Design a protein around this ligand. Sequence first.
Ligand SMILES: *[C@@H]1O[C@H](CO)[C@@H](O)[C@H](O)[C@H]1NC(C)=O
Ligand SMILES: *[C@@H]1O[C@H](CO)[C@@H](O)[C@H](O)[C@H]1NC(C)=O
Ligand SMILES: *[C@@H]1O[C@H](CO)[C@@H](O)[C@H](O)[C@H]1NC(C)=O
Ligand SMILES: *[C@@H]1O[C@H](CO)[C@@H](O)[C@H](O)[C@H]1NC(C)=O
Ligand SMILES: *[C@@H]1O[C@H](CO)[C@@H](O)[C@H](O)[C@H]1NC(C)=O
Ligand SMILES: *[C@@H]1O[C@H](CO)[C@@H](O)[C@H](O)[C@H]1NC(C)=O
Ligand SMILES: *[C@@H]1O[C@H](CO)[C@@H](O)[C@H](O)[C@H]1NC(C)=O
Ligand SMILES: *[C@@H]1O[C@H](CO)[C@@H](O)[C@H](O)[C@H]1NC(C)=O
Ligand SMILES: *[C@@H]1O[C@H](CO)[C@@H](O)[C@H](O)[C@H]1NC(C)=O
Ligand SMILES: *[C@@H]1O[C@H](CO)[C@@H](O)[C@H](O)[C@H]1NC(C)=O
Ligand SMILES: *[C@@H]1O[C@H](CO)[C@@H](O)[C@H](O)[C@H]1NC(C)=O
Ligand SMILES: *[C@@H]1O[C@H](CO)[C@@H](O)[C@H](O)[C@H]1NC(C)=O
Lengths: 463, 463, 463, 463
Amino acid sequence: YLKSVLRELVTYLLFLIVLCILTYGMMSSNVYYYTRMMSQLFLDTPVSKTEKTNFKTLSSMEDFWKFTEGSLLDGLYWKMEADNRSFIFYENLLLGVPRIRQLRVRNGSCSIPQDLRDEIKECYDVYSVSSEDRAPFGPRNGTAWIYTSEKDLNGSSHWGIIATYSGAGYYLDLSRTREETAAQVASLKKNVWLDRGTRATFIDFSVYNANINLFCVVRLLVEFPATGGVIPSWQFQPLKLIRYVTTFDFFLAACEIIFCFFIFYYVVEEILRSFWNCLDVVIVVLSVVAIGINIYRTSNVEVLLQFLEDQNTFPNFEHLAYWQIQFNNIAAVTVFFVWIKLFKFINFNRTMSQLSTTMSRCAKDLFGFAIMFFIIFLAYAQLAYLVFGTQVDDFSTFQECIFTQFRIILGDINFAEIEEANRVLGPIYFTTFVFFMFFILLNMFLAIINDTYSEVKSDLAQQ
Amino acid sequence: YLKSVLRELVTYLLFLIVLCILTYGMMSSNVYYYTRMMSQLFLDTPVSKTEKTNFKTLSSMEDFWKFTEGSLLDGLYWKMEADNRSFIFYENLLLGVPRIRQLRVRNGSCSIPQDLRDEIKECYDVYSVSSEDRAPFGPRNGTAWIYTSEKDLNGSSHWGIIATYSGAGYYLDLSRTREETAAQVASLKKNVWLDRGTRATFIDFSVYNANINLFCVVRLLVEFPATGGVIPSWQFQPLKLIRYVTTFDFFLAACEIIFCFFIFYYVVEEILRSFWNCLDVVIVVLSVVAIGINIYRTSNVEVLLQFLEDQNTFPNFEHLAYWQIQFNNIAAVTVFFVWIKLFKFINFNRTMSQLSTTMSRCAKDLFGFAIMFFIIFLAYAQLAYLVFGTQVDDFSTFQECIFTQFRIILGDINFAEIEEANRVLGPIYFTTFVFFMFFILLNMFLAIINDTYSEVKSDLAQQ
Amino acid sequence: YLKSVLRELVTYLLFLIVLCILTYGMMSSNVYYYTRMMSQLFLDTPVSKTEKTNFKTLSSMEDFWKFTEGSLLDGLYWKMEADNRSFIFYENLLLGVPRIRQLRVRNGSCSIPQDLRDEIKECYDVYSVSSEDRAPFGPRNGTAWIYTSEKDLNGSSHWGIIATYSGAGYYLDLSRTREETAAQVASLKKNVWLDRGTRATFIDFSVYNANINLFCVVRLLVEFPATGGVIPSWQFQPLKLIRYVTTFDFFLAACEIIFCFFIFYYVVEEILRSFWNCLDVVIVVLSVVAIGINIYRTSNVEVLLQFLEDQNTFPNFEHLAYWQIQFNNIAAVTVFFVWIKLFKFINFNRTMSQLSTTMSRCAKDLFGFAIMFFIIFLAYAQLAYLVFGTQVDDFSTFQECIFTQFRIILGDINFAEIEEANRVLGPIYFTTFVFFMFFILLNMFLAIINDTYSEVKSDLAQQ
Amino acid sequence: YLKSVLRELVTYLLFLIVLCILTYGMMSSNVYYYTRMMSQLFLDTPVSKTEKTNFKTLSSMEDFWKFTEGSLLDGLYWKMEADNRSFIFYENLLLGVPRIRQLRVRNGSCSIPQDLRDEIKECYDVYSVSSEDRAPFGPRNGTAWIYTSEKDLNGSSHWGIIATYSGAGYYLDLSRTREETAAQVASLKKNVWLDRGTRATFIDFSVYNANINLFCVVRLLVEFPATGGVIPSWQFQPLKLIRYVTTFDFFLAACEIIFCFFIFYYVVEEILRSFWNCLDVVIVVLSVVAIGINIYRTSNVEVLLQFLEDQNTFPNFEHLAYWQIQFNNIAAVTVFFVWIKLFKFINFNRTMSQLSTTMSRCAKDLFGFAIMFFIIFLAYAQLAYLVFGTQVDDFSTFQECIFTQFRIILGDINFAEIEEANRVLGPIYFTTFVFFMFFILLNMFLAIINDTYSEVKSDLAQQ
Ligand SMILES: *[C@@H]1O[C@H](CO)[C@@H](O)[C@H](O)[C@H]1NC(C)=O
Ligand SMILES: *[C@@H]1O[C@H](CO)[C@@H](O)[C@H](O)[C@H]1NC(C)=O
Ligand SMILES: *[C@@H]1O[C@H](CO)[C@@H](O)[C@H](O)[C@H]1NC(C)=O
Ligand SMILES: *[C@@H]1O[C@H](CO)[C@@H](O)[C@H](O)[C@H]1NC(C)=O
Ligand SMILES: *[C@@H]1O[C@H](CO)[C@@H](O)[C@H](O)[C@H]1NC(C)=O
Ligand SMILES: *[C@@H]1O[C@H](CO)[C@@H](O)[C@H](O)[C@H]1NC(C)=O
Ligand SMILES: *[C@@H]1O[C@H](CO)[C@@H](O)[C@H](O)[C@H]1NC(C)=O
Ligand SMILES: *[C@@H]1O[C@H](CO)[C@@H](O)[C@H](O)[C@H]1NC(C)=O
Ligand SMILES: *[C@@H]1O[C@H](CO)[C@@H](O)[C@H](O)[C@H]1NC(C)=O
Ligand SMILES: *[C@@H]1O[C@H](CO)[C@@H](O)[C@H](O)[C@H]1NC(C)=O
Ligand SMILES: *[C@@H]1O[C@H](CO)[C@@H](O)[C@H](O)[C@H]1NC(C)=O
Ligand SMILES: *[C@@H]1O[C@H](CO)[C@@H](O)[C@H](O)[C@H]1NC(C)=O
């Protein structure tokens, strides 16, 4: 019997090191510095030589135009040998052409109160699919001034910080050289292409590095709330599109075939309470979804093929970059659970079995109290969100009030801005929360664990 | 019997989701960014193009005048279509006219020691109602140079950081356009309108956004301590004055009528130790006070009606903004306690009843020790306030010494400035406090909880 | 018997509120802002309009001269009505005249290794009383270039960050007006008054505010390590020299007489193990030392009397400012222990007596373990000081390694600079320390407390 | 018997204070400020008067050349008396001559995917020993353009942040005076000496201070990842090369002879489970390795002798600086364990023996759980490294994911950049980690300790 348990064990071990290789394989080492250099080049540099603002700092439309005609262009273009081709840092192709796209809301989307109608002529509602503006505003001379559908314009919905944004909109494709684009952008500034109705503008381009082999897909997102102002956000996503270059790449591709066999085998075994059963299900479920993504989605690479035909176009990678994120996310979570499955095999020792039986017994009591706990925890969260949240960034949304309260328990705090927001409840909230939660309530978990642990040591000693 | 308990339960649940809607309803989602853009526009921008100071940074009267003639004016005025009307960010009316007001203390308010009378001619005491200056200083040509009572000048006492300030004072109303105000402020600077005797100056104006429907009331407060210098502070308060625009607004107004019924019903039930009784009282008390505020106070909106008649005046919203703060505060605290009332219904399960009976028993022991605890805790607070508090900001006041000690327990610390203040007690205070409080004393709570918990598990197991 | 215990109790209570008044009385409320404005005026302002350095930032002698001829002069002088008198912020007399003093080390104080004697001509040792330079360097035209003894130059030893400094040295007194001093300082710069041999320079002046009644004594200390460079440090100390102005000042002076009676009475009672006895001794000891300081030291005020005779001199307050620090320190520590003496009276309740008997029993076990603990704790401290401490500021000295380890336990950390210092032990130190100390060892206290607590609840229940 | 235990005790005590002296002796007090001034002079100063970047901030090759021709030269040269000799801060010889060295990778080191070969002409692989470029690029006019082997160029492999770097490379030695070097560096800039193929450049020089007697060896390392950009790093290492100057130096040298005797004696005693035996072994092992380093390695000082002959050369100290690091590291770790050996002697008291027997019993249970713990801990680490690590600095490498998770437990967090990286898993990771690890799992240690402690108090009381 112990042999059969060890029989399935060695099976499991290989499944680890197979999976251990893919992750280490599918992720190059220093990639962090590849994004870091991109980000610092765009995000972190002064919008203009005389200006102190970053891209992260943009407060206004005026700042935005200074960015486009500013550090952005000077970030995208380098000379340097085509010379129509520009190597960022000299190591990185700007791949194809950048694209700017905006989203726009209709005039009468909202309604002015009858009292002020004599005062205010027109309003523009918060962005929504219903309120979107499809009208051909402006000179109507091209794709910049004419709406194009999300189908006709290949693209997908992007999820921003205040809203989700459709792929459709008013877009313009830039040019290969700095001189040509600077003309276009100037024209988009001369004519007013950012108006009261613009909610969001996207700037997307892709970069290819040949030293290591990686694409980098960039999305610079700028939102224009109905309240005025600017909310910048960005995404820098590396990709591995060309999977066969080095022999080591072929080495990995072998495993992805081998790794496919195991899952097929675990599906076989899984055919037929318990916790460890619920574990195996979760692994197999995610393991399939990972492969499903890896094949009929991320292995298509139809875009690259089209792009390499004509290199003057916009290389739309937004989807490919999207799925590999979803892939990496899922792949990681599998790996995590796969490690936890190892505890099933640690019961060899007395002391280990001594512990496992305790935590198994810990569960029913703790879970019962966690409910009691989070009801109180979420009460504060909802309280903090009503008192703060029009003031403090950390409390801005109900999601982030929850996260902030974890940071408080750990000691990450900005107390000053809490007290500035409300000089009465700010202190009361903080004090009472820190008191009841951190002093009394956290200790109530640890009370449960001691009892249930010492109890299990009591009776097992009786045996 | 269990049906009756469940009978009152479903009653309670509806009362939640009713109340859950109002809060979510009465608070728009992204409002945070509406204040954030206002604040960054005024607080966060350099006082002048050549100057590095914010409004938050003001160190002197000279800096203050640079702010008024500086970023303030350039923040309030935009061109842009009336053109007498100015849209901040282009989305936000500057509503009516700004108003500047100062407070002033009499000459002989204080007394010079007889030894130095030959040296120093005149002193000016710390601001107080007694020492306030009602004399018509200066050219005496208008409301700027003539005192006006808090009654005659509609307004209320504001509570600042070093003092409470009456609504009365010397005020001047600005103009609609940047050119006219810049003349006025220049005249207030030419003639000396900020002198030895000025303790505080207020800058108040209101802003209306039509996209979302919200007013924003702004108070820029600047204090001039008797010690010289400047202490800036600010308040940005959104308001919802016009309550019927969208159908969803009508949807909410229905609930506020429905919600009024429940409280009337709970008042009926409450007519006749125990803890849960003390809970219901607290809810009903606050729930009434909330409605009282909501009706005969915040539902008056007499000011708006007067303002819309003549739009060249100062739209005094200070009160309306005040009460909605008090309203939101009270509303939040009710919601908080309403959630806690849910524990009364969690006793269905064994394990829950297992826990409830423990924490009920935890109380008498913990409270007994908390007294023992805070006596020690407050001892340090008073110690730290005497040693520090002339040096370190965090210890500046006895209130904030208490808060600082919570931040220390959690790990939020600036130790450097503590050691700079006193190089001997600074370390001794910090060491001993962290030692006795965090090591020994916190653990004394958790000692109590373990005992009382394991005891309750002992005897209930006997049954 | 319970009456006698209550008889001594009410005696004790009055002693609190008497002492509670003096502290609140002897410390004005907003004084923090009085120093804060002084500090920001001097410390925090750019050394020159074109320079970005503060006084806190000084890296070099060149920076120092830029400070003296820079923000310092522009900080000390204001116009403004004598006009020979200058009111800082317009509220604050510059009192008398500033004074600059330096300390200097002899040439041959150190010894050059025989190998390099052909290379290096001369060395200057670290500052010490033995190596001090009394020679009249330079043009020898005045007190700036001639040594004056600590006796002949009224003054005391000051304790700096790298060394203790005698009051003696080479000093120069500045002038009343900005124009005259700027000439002097220029001459001290033209002629080289800061040379290889200068270890430290002091800048001392006093400021009087008449609105509130307080002096402010300032010491700007700049050290010049033997390694080259600059280490700035500062002290801003308020004082209350004139004790009778307001009636409330007379009100306090009454208590200081009353408060003297109590201590005389407690000395009577104390004439004749136990812990509470050891408490009363400590209070009475400190309470005497406080009064001793308060009378024959701080109540002398002979300097002020001399100063007010001739106001063109340097008002040496360094001692008076020193003692009131020592006074405030001692006064605070008494107050702290006085509160703790209150626990002697909390034994009325069962639960309180229930707790007191536990912590009394906790002592012998905890203290035994604390020894075991700090041996390990200090081991790391000594380890961290050897590995780091040539690199990381926080570990610079063995004293501060101890403090840093407390900050680590609480979560205040700069990990980056630890890893930069040593990329191997840095992580190992941090990991192992956080592991053994925070996981295992802290929990060993709490293990002791639970046992000894639950034990005391066990047997007392048997009674 | 107790005498013999005390007999070995006093032996041990002397061994402490002997060792206590050496450490305090071998480490001068204020050395921290000696490096701090060096670092701030080079690292912390603006690359140019018009530029805001430090050396720490370098983002590009262009920035690098601005640094060399910039603050570096102005940092190395001072006038000041030879005058060919330059005293940094006037206290510090620039010793000999600086040296710049770069490392270079071959053209075809990597391979371009066949699809893009028409596009991209050439690639340069990540630095490795295999891909290193030994070809004489450029004008081939000197050691700057010609490869020199690590043997022929005295030097050792340096371990950088992304790679290990051989001592070999293309180097150039600068000149004694600022004017001459500025010509050389200009020529290295005119001709392109930093190209696509440069992975890393080193700048090494040594500084001698005669006031205190210390050398300071400096390494300024700049890496050029294959992804483009710059990654600066630095090392400032003090040294004591000349060991006999002061009598106190002779005093220490006596102990190093005495200290050699003890280890010889403990080797004698150690000749022949238990834990304390395993302790003594570790001490003796390290104690030997320390002396081995101290004699046939660090006591050679052959370089200094050669250097003092001809002072126009490059004084290569890289090795000497290296070993004293290794020496200080080992010396510290010995001292640490030596303190812990003191617990062997604390068993005199009951309470101490009461504790020792507990922690001895704590071990087997805790260690069993630590395994269970770190499996979970490392699971998160591997998870966080896959999700983050292309984004967040703190997660950049798997090593640092581990360290980051310790900082999270303590409360050191940057949550913002976690949420920006991944807006879904970022919160989930952080929440679940903080929940399971900090709430449940940490408390599982403390559960073990309570049980095993109270158990030992149970049975010992029975005796
Ligand atoms: C928006 O609609 C209102 C409603 O009539 C109209 O008065 C205004 O001119 C419109 N503005 C634009 C830019 O279409
Ligand atoms: C549309 O008309 C404007 C007005 O002159 C012109 O500047 C612009 O170039 C035109 N658009 C295109 C695509 O030619
Ligand atoms: C979408 O993809 C199709 C596929 O060839 C292409 O023809 C079309 O131009 C794309 N749409 C764009 C680039 O807007
Ligand atoms: C303030 O009062 C004193 C008291 O006589 C007087 O000398 C001084 O001129 C007064 N100053 C002002 C501005 O009124
Ligand atoms: C008061 O007199 C001054 C002095 O000329 C003048 O500048 C100011 O305008 C006058 N005030 C008013 C309200 O006209
Ligand atoms: C106060 O309110 C009354 C009400 O109409 C108004 O007449 C008066 O002008 C207000 N006071 C001001 C604006 O100072
Ligand atoms: C310091 O002493 C040395 C020893 O002779 C001498 O050569 C040097 O000139 C002296 N320098 C000064 C400034 O006194
Ligand atoms: C000492 O001599 C120098 C040299 O001219 C002179 O500038 C300085 O003023 C003299 N000192 C005094 C106190 O006059
Ligand atoms: C020290 O105090 C005495 C007392 O009058 C005074 O005469 C002397 O000038 C003082 N020394 C100074 C100011 O250096
Ligand atoms: C690098 O190698 C490729 C391969 O042929 C060649 O085309 C290119 O010119 C080479 N570049 C340099 C700088 O040697
Ligand atoms: C190599 O040739 C270049 C080209 O003129 C010249 O500038 C450089 O000085 C030469 N190298 C040496 C070491 O002379
Ligand atoms: C290495 O050391 C030898 C020993 O004398 C020396 O001759 C040679 O020049 C050194 N190599 C250098 C400095 O590159």
